Ligand binder design. Structure first.
Ligand SMILES: *[C@@H]1O[C@H](CO)[C@@H](O[C@@H]2O[C@H](CO)[C@@H](O[C@H]3O[C@H](CO[C@H]4O[C@H](CO[C@H]5O[C@H](CO)[C@@H](O)[C@H](O)[C@@H]5O)[C@@H](O)[C@H](O[C@H]5O[C@H](CO)[C@@H](O)[C@H](O)[C@@H]5O)[C@@H]4O)[C@@H](O[C@H]4O[C@H](CO)[C@@H](O)[C@H](O)[C@@H]4O)[C@H](O)[C@@H]3O)[C@H](O)[C@H]2NC(C)=O)[C@H](O)[C@H]1NC(C)=O
Ligand SMILES: *[C@@H]1O[C@H](CO)[C@@H](O[C@@H]2O[C@H](CO)[C@@H](O[C@H]3O[C@H](CO[C@H]4O[C@H](CO[C@H]5O[C@H](CO)[C@@H](O)[C@H](O)[C@@H]5O)[C@@H](O)[C@H](O[C@H]5O[C@H](CO)[C@@H](O)[C@H](O)[C@@H]5O)[C@@H]4O)[C@@H](O[C@H]4O[C@H](CO)[C@@H](O)[C@H](O)[C@@H]4O)[C@H](O)[C@@H]3O)[C@H](O)[C@H]2NC(C)=O)[C@H](O)[C@H]1NC(C)=O
Ligand SMILES: *[C@@H]1O[C@H](CO)[C@@H](O)[C@H](O)[C@H]1NC(C)=O
Ligand SMILES: *[C@@H]1O[C@H](CO)[C@@H](O)[C@H](O)[C@H]1NC(C)=O
Ligand SMILES: *[C@@H]1O[C@H](CO)[C@@H](O)[C@H](O)[C@H]1NC(C)=O
Ligand SMILES: *[C@@H]1O[C@H](CO)[C@@H](O)[C@H](O)[C@H]1NC(C)=O
Lengths: 407, 234, 266, 266, 407, 234
């Protein structure tokens, strides 16, 4: 049993070949039959995840249960993900949190990020920055330790709705300014030197200002900057490599393993993985979810992707209320999400469709000369709106001219 | 799944001898789960029926009419203004809305393009979609502004929108127009949050009580060391 | 006529296939028109449907302004037009103005107006040797005299304010070329003035040829002055033309065939 | 002859003035030549002198290879050469190859060879209807035939090994144009073979016209095939030509005037 | 007397106008008649320098003598410059050093840079890095102090023979690594962190590695890196602005004040100011120097500009021995300076003229096929040698073909 | 001014009672200067006549002939080599000059293009040059190398150039050719610097003596001191 698990890890760490990785798991899958409690948790996360073992969601649920009855943090975390996403099992947010709490209790780090994110965006619970400070803190300590050892493995951020040294020494200098190395400590001026180190892109500085805005040192402790500084540290763990395992599944034609390897990171609180896990459900390529639970589940992950500051997720939340995707048709509700992507994020399309609801009298009362403003505002915001406003303004004047003739 | 990111939850640990409440949310004896921690600790954590229906909160209010709350704001004459990319809206609560923008000449002159949008010479509270949410409001509608060339020299009109916020300091979320030369202003104030029908609506919290099986104590052995750890860190 | 309707339908079938390709990809108004703009074959077919549309507008404009082509100027447009297609194509690419679908549309407006000046020249050339000309011909060609010269006056006025307000760009060569075209409608006027006083009198006039040779001398002097000033500018600002030496050698030869012949005569 | 020497002296005076201006500035060999290469008017005057030199070499080559111009092909050279210099200029400027003084020389070499093929065209066209031709004409024109054919074979070989070794550049279009010129020397061979078997017999041959029509059909097919492959290559790689559609319309018309006439005849 | 000097400095520091600067000096020139020992040293450096008072070299020599008899450091320094450059007075290097020593003794900083540079390049004295260490230091202490106050005023480096935050904190971190701030000092690893700070361009770091290579800390104390690191600090003083005062005189047509305001900085040991002070003397635009002392004085400043690593100053030292400028004609001596600019600095022209002395048999014995190598080597080194080698190689083969015919 | 950057100078402070030396450089009693320091110390610094002529250094050498010094270098067989951009010259003192370059094939083979430039089977010392300046040398000239195709299969010849350097470790300044396939090698050695006619030539130093006037001490009130100040950093 235990001898079989050693052969798999040797070939996994020794060979990067796809066949050799699958050949290494053959002993690991056989060791799962011997109920070695370390063996299943490496094949549980392949039986339901894919791009490793073949994907079979029903084959992983029942053996997750014995992982829960054993009391495994890696089993308590994932069984909450099944009931949070309604994946192969009837959806229930009521005890989705119960499994995540015991996973967060059990020492798992994924169940702390999700519980922290649920406390931060107010999803499933009350938005409490105090509770969102506690759970996001435990992840940050367990990821800031490993980056200093692993060197900070950077992973590209790929959004499908868009396509388909010098500062390292400044961190130690800013650490000595706040603490005091041969000089009196000054929290008023050490803040500016430490905050400028994070603009270089290194996330070690991102950690140190989060504690600075937590205890109240230097600047007064505000909740909004307490966890938002914490969150970008937590979004770069060893689970940040999991876009690539999901994105390769999308390019390899296995679209149903790019909607399960993305729905975990959508539950983990991303925006690259919350638009993409909804864009795949947008075009109905997924097959585990039914044909009637494809748009309401893609509405949920378009709604979370908008509140985290995405332009397209605020236009595409207007579309789903414009046509009637997953909701009874609401021209008034779709109106607001189109303007909220106009004044805030200055999305060029988002004032063109503002003109259409102004020009054709949808949602609000019609006014011809108010619509002219937003078409004109569209051409100022972008170079690509010069064309599709001009054929819209010509159509606009035809109605104005034809109405004047009838009078 | 349908609008599921608005339902709050809370896990509690009431212990062994606990009786589920018969008031509030509904409960069942079948929807229980048997739990196990990392240090082999058995818990039975029950969950309520997620309905949270009706409005049976015993809504009573013997206080003043909502007209009387904004009177101290009117007499103090402390009124704010808002900046934009170009324009500048100065709503004055109880006097006027003023929209203007300064044209700074090259060295000596400042030119003002000003407009006037108003001047002060039912068992259901109406609600407007605010970012897609449900907030009941106080409308204060008013007109006789400057004449509007598009409406053939008609004076502008405007409605004042009042919604409550606890940390507000009398600012504006946004200024918007429902039609040409007739504008809508939203105003944040802390006065209306005391009104039960005008306060910010929060959904009732469905409580997850959970009972401690024998062989396990009142709270798990991997839990209480963490809330004291953040208490030290604060 | 059958091959003309075939060519229009075989172009509109491609445009209705490119548009229906984009609308299936991007199912809205705004991302569709943006997708047509950035895509190369999508804007290529929309270019082809634009040129067929300006072709058929030219054929109906030629039909209303001239009763029937004589099939001796039909060739004479085809070489000149080619001349004109290539040098606008070379001036468009030398200047690094980049491919924009509102300055290509301006260049074929120049070529479309340039073709109509040339058609007026050959029609007024046979107005010299037409003893049977109706009053319909006289009015329909002075209408072409006005409509052109006002149009080049407008575009010269649009360009010389563009060369002052904006700066040195491709709008300089537009108004200069229209200034040459302004001299071109100037030439055919005087030729129409002298050949209208020829027809109203039932006797030849010897001074008409002297005035015609003097008039061709005139404007030929104006033409080389415009081309020589056109040379001296773009060496100074931007880059060497590498074009517009085509009609210039014909412009000196226009001056050569006028000044030297008058010197040999007078 | 006086004006030719006047033009040569007036170009060499400017070249000597530019060289002396540079030598007074940078009194050595190497900075003088480098200063000539970097300066714009200096390289312009050197370009003018090079063009006058290649003009005089072309005149002496035409004098030694043809006894006297008929003064009916001199025009044909003038319009076709304008066509050609503008096509080469536009192909040089679209490709963004940048102004280099060793590819302009190659382009004028191509234009010079094209002019000599056109002169061979018109000379064998009059050889069709020339009843008094000496053996000197036959020998000199077949020497032209060889020399031209060997030159285009050599440059086609050079350009195809270039397109294999280096990569996609202007050598591909150089080799394709030299392949078209190879088809041109092929056409005149067959035409000279038929018109030479015509003259050696003192009787007309009816099969000579059929062979001439079949050969014209032949090579017209080869020409349109080469132009279509030329298209389908440069839409794929780099950019739209925007040139070489000129002789293509004449190439399809060459196919039209051969295939349809033979279909109407046979 | 003293009241007149206050009005000049007030208008000088208050008005940057050229007329107001000259109007301020009117009281200063009048105060020079009262023999105020502070007043002359601001007008002595205008009477002989220019671009201030009108240039009159003889009008400044005799009043420099009373500045010397008083014992002024600013008079002892400049009177040695007159006899070092032979400027208005017969040249004598013998007591040029005597005046510079007492100026260096008197506390002047210019007389320490020149004495240090003379000890470094071995000009007028024996090349002793020990003596060049002592005099170059005193300047570096007196310039790094003001640069921390003035912000390090940068001045462009203009050569006439060519035309006519992130690292600031790394200096303090590297300073703490060598000294020890909360950690044990390690001179083996603090060297690499300190040396990387100087690559950013800041010259505070240039000072700190000079002391590191001086006392032997970290790396063994080598003479060559001891003063070269010191020298680039000294070449950025408040006298580094004196190029613009000299370069503006060249563009304003006052060429005889761009050969005196450049000959001091040539004596101070520059290479931007040693080619340019020889390029002006190259074309005989200067008028103070005679027509017979114009090339030997321009040979001296082309020789110093070459040994400090300039490409053109090594070719142009070949030319002066090639034609016979200021020296009896030496094809052998001119040969060496042409190849020393070929193997070392890879100057493209410097192998072309190597071909000419190879092809035409000048200096060495003629060999036709050896010359072919260097013309061919010229085209590989630069893109601009493709042309003037091709007309040289065609001429080369004509001789080879014509000689073969005669055989 | 003519080649003036080769004449060394030195200021000395011999004091009040000093007599100028009559041997070495010439002196005059008129070319004195009266000096004054910042603290008003008066000095009289005499200067010598800048001639430094002749070679009257009493050149005597009873030591060995220059042939005998390079013999221990020949028998030890410790010989160096030089790198270039492409080539690699390996002079072996007392055996040969070898010029070669390795061609590294893709994985397995190493190809050598080698040539042989030589093999060991007068009251005035000649002077070449060396970087513009002057240096007398020892020439060691050989031939019988590999045949040269340019000279119609003639073997190459090479002269070995010996110049002395104190800190040398038997390296090469440069390798050069005076003609095709006949090459010149310069070699640094420390052996010849003991030879008086072969050592590195240094110009004699002209001494500047400063006589101390009364009222001023033996050395200026800023000298000694400042010197010792750095004597700290000695
Ligand atoms: C960076 O910042 C810059 C400035 O901060 C931005 O620059 C832009 O600058 C231009 C200046 O050229 C601004 O354009 C206009 O500015 C003035 C003001 O006109 C504005 O207001 C008009 C008022 O009309 C309405 O008024 C009431 C509003 O409450 C209504 O009740 C009423 O019914 C009426 O509708 C407004 O009409 C106009 O908007 C549009 O109007 C029509 C149709 O409505 C459109 O077709 C237009 O295209 C126009 O955009 C403006 O918002 C204007 O001067 C006016 O007054 C002078 C007084 O002498 C008159 O002479 C003149 O004829 C005119 O009437 C200007 O001429 C110009 O039109 C523009 O607003 C700025 N843009 C922004 C976004 O602020 C720059 O964009 C910024 N960079 C960015 C964002 O990247
Ligand atoms: C970066 O580094 C790169 C390498 O480090 C540099 O790259 C260049 O690489 C090319 C490779 O293509 C090198 O070119 C030549 O390389 C070999 C070797 O030929 C050299 O040696 C020839 C020997 O001839 C002399 O030998 C004796 C020397 O002591 C003499 O005694 C003898 O009399 C004879 O003269 C030499 O002749 C040649 O130099 C030039 O020769 C003639 C005239 O002399 C010129 O016209 C040429 O232009 C040539 O430059 C070379 O220095 C060569 O292969 C040889 O051997 C094979 C064996 O099979 C033969 O098949 C082949 O025909 C040839 O004879 C190559 O073919 C090529 O010619 C070049 O040297 C490198 N350049 C440098 C500067 O090192 C690159 O330049 C560097 N980047 C920079 C500096 O920016
Ligand atoms: C999920 O719940 C539905 C409705 O309560 C029920 O019909 C279904 O059988 C349940 N499925 C599972 C796997 O529990
Ligand atoms: C929803 O689920 C049912 C299964 O009960 C299925 O038959 C149906 O196709 C799905 N979709 C819709 C739109 O009803
Ligand atoms: C400089 O010295 C020369 C020669 O000794 C002499 O003729 C000249 O007068 C001297 N000039 C001065 C100013 O001392
Ligand atoms: C050198 O100086 C003398 C003055 O004695 C002057 O006359 C002469 O022109 C100068 N130049 C030469 C080349 O002699």
């Amino acid at each position: 049993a235990e001898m079989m698990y050693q052969t798999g890890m040797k070939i996994l760490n020794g060979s990067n070949k796809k066949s050799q990785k699958r050949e290494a798991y053959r002993y690991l899958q056989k060791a799962a039959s011997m109920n070695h409690t370390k063996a299943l948790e490496r094949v549980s996360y392949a039986l339901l995840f894919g791009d490793y073992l073949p994907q079979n969601i029903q084959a992983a649920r029942e053996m997750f249960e014995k992982l829960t009855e054993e009391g495994s943090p890696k089993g308590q975390t994932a069984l909450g993900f099944l009931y949070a996403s309604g994946l192969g099992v009837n959806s229930s947010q009521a005890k989705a949190l119960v499994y995540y709490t015991f996973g967060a209790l059990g020492g798992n780090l994924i169940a702390h990020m999700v519980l922290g994110y649920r406390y931060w965006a107010g999803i499933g619970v009350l938005q409490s920055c105090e509770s969102a400070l506690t759970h996001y803190r435990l992840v940050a300590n367990h990821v800031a330790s490993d980056i200093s050892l692993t060197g900070g493995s950077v992973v590209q951020r790929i959004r499908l709705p868009d396509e388909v040294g010098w500062v390292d020494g400044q961190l130690q200098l800013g650490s000595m300014y706040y603490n005091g190395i041969g000089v009196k400590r000054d929290y008023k001026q050490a803040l500016k030197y430490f905050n400028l180190a994070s603009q270089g892109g290194h996330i070690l500085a991102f950690y140190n200002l989060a504690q600075m805005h937590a205890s109240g040192t230097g600047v007064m402790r505000s909740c909004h900057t307490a966890v938002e500084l914490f969150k970008n540290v937590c979004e770069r763990g060893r689970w940040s490599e999991r876009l690539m395992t999901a994105y390769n599944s999308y390019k390899d034609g296995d679209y149903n393993a790019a909607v399960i390897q993305y729905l975990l990171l959508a539950e983990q609180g991303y925006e690259v993985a919350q638009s993409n896990a909804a864009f795949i459900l947008d075009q109905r390529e997924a097959s585990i979810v039914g044909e009637n639970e494809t748009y309401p589940r893609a509405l949920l992950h378009w709604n979370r992707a908008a509140s985290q500051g995405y332009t397209v997720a605020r236009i595409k939340l207007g579309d789903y209320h414009f046509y009637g995707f997953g909701t009874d048709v609401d021209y008034e509700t779709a109106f607001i999400h189109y303007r909220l992507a106009s004044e805030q994020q200055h999305s060029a399309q988002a004032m063109f469709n503002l003109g259409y609801m102004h020009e054709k009298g949808l949602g609000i009362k019609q006014d011809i000369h108010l619509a002219k403003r937003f078409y004109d505002m569209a051409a100022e915001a972008s170079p690509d709106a010069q064309v599709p406003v001009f054929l819209a303004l010509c159509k606009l004047g035809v109605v104005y001219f034809l109405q004047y003739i009838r009078e | 799944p349908q609008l599921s990111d608005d339902i709050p939850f809370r896990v509690n640990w009431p212990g062994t001898e606990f009786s589920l409440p018969t008031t509030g949310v509904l409960y069942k004896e079948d929807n229980y789960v048997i739990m196990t921690t990392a240090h082999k600790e058995k818990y039975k954590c029950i969950l309520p029926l997620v309905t949270s229906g009706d409005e049976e909160e015993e809504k009573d209010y013997k206080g003043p009419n909502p007209r009387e709350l904004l009177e101290p704001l009117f007499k103090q004459s402390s009124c704010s203004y808002r900046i934009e990319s170009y324009w500048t809206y100065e709503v004055c609560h109880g006097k006027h809305i003023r929209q203007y923008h300064e044209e700074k000449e090259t060295g000596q002159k400042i030119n003002i393009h000003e407009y006037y949008l108003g001047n002060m010479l039912s068992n259901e509270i109406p609600t407007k979609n605010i970012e897609g949410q449900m907030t009941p409001y106080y409308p204060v509608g008013m007109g006789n502004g400057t004449p509007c060339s598009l409406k053939q020299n008609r004076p502008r009109s405007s409605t004042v929108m009042y919604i409550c916020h606890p940390e507000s300091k009398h600012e504006i979320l946004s200024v918007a127009e429902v039609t040409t030369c007739e504008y809508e202003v939203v105003i944040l104030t802390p006065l209306l949050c005391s009104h039960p029908k005008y306060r910010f609506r929060a959904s009732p919290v469905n409580d997850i009580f959970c009972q401690s099986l024998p062989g396990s104590p009142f709270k798990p052995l991997t839990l209480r060391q963490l809330e004291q750890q953040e208490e030290i860190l604060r | 006529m059958f091959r003309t309707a075939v060519m229009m339908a075989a172009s509109l079938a491609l445009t209705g296939a490119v548009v229906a390709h984009a609308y299936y990809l991007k199912h809205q108004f705004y991302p569709t028109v943006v997708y047509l703009t950035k895509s190369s074959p999508s804007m290529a077919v929309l270019y082809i449907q634009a040129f067929v549309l300006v072709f058929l507008l030219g054929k109906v404009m030629g039909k209303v302004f001239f009763g029937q082509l004589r099939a001796a100027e039909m060739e004479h447009l085809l070489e000149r037009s080619w001349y004109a297609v290539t040098e606008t194509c070379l001036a468009f690419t030398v200047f690094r103005d980049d491919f924009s679908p509102r300055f290509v549309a301006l260049f074929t407006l120049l070529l479309f107006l340039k073709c109509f000046h040339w058609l007026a020249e050959d029609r007024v050339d046979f107005m010299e040797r037409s003893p049977n000309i109706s009053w319909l011909f006289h009015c329909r060609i002075v209408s072409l005299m006005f409509l052109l010269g006002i149009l080049d006056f407008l575009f010269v006025s649009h360009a010389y304010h563009s060369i002052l307000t904006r700066g040195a760009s491709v709008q300089l060569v537009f108004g200069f070329e229209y200034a040459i075209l302004m001299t071109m409608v100037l030439t055919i006027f005087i030729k129409y003035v002298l050949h209208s006083v020829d027809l109203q009198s039932e006797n030849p006039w010897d001074n008409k040829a002297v005035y015609m040779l003097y008039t061709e001398l005139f404007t030929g002097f104006i033409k080389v002055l415009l081309y020589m000033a056109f040379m001296t500018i773009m060496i100074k600002v931007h880059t060497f033309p590498l074009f517009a030496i085509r009609p210039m050698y014909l412009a000196m030869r226009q001056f050569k065939k006028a000044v030297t012949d008058a010197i040999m005569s007078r």
